[PDB]
């Protein structure tokens, strides 16, 4: 599955 390299940290 394609996962974003950056997101808002949890």
């Amino acid at each position, epitope marked *: *599955k*394609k*996962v*974003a*390299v*950056v*997101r*808002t940290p949890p």
Partner: antibody
Amino acid sequence: EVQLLESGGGLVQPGGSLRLSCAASGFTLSSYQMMWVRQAPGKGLEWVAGITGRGGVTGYADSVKGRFTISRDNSKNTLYLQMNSLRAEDTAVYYCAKPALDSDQCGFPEAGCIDAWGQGTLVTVSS
Amino acid sequence: SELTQDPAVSVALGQTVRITCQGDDSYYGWYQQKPGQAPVTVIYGNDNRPSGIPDRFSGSSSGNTASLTITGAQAEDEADYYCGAYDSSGGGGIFGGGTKLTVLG
């Protein structure tokens, strides 16, 4: 259909500010990480800034960091780029760019995941 | 990082052209741009062709090299092709200097 439409472009003095706007239709902006790409006359594409789905993380190219501010209004389906203390080297057609996959799959700097491009808005930084 | 592509390439009308891009560990996009126009996505995510793009456009990504193949080159394919990808060192988006395609014959 997916449509991205930018405004805010024009002639500005060196040291001046310009606010770019990108209005998204045919999809929900909040489901996507977004980015700004620019192109100097007769030159190549260059990534400027990127933002996450809720705007928790932003990213900028080395040359615009500290002067430019990428922001978004999910409620208005609009992406913004505040460009302060502009220089002649910032003269370019500025495009709004949309990743093909949602915020969980494609991040704002993944410039290989773009499926939709804006019409572009010309920024002229001249005295 | 940065993305490397040849500034120019030529193909005879009706033949096959392969445009390469050089980078490391990436998810590649291919964007067609005509002189007065905005870019158009011909391929994204190495091989994903958007609906509406003719199937004469195909994308392949081998070990540290992305490829855009245009089978049966038509007069309307004469444009600038840019490769896009991710720069993990810097944390930003990267583009190749572009490849202007000339459809001869």
